[PDB]
Amino acid sequence: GKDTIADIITCIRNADMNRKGTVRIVSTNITENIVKILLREGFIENARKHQERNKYFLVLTLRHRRNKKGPYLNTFHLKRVSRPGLRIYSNYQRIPRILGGMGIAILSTSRGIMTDREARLEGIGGEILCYIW
């Protein structure tokens, strides 16, 4: 648990590859925000919170299998960019865009977390958390 962000991302990727809709993730401001964003983008069905023994679990419903489990044309990819060993930052004009914009990029900036779209409207650069296909 040296990195929480990468961990969330990873659990998602694993549950996804295994064709399961439901994931338990540990909550945190970052986690919660990231998931919110993930919802307003439409990458994930629904999110909700649970509590036991002062632990918080966000469970995430995931988009249903593609017209069977066997014949899948599409998966859902996640990639950590800035990680504890190398922190990647970008100014306004270097802000990444994924596959011509089909995917998104998550930024942590002065005004909070957002997508690259929001950064382009508001004109801010910052730290790039991950890429999402």
Minimum gap (Å) between residue 9 Cβ and RNA: 6
Minimum gap (Å) between residue 40 Cβ and RNA: 17
Our CB check for RNA shows the closer of 6 and 98 to be: 6
Residues that bind RNA (CB under 7 A): 1-4, 6-7, 9-11, 13-15, 17-20, 24, 26, 28-30, 53-56, 80, 83-87, 89-94, 108-113, 123-127
- How does DSSP assign 16-62, residue by residue? HHTT-S-EEEE--HHHHHHHHHHHHHTSSSEEEEEEETTEEEEEEE-
Give the H or E element holding residue 116: helix 116-122
Our CB check for RNA shows the closer of 109 and 115 to be: 109
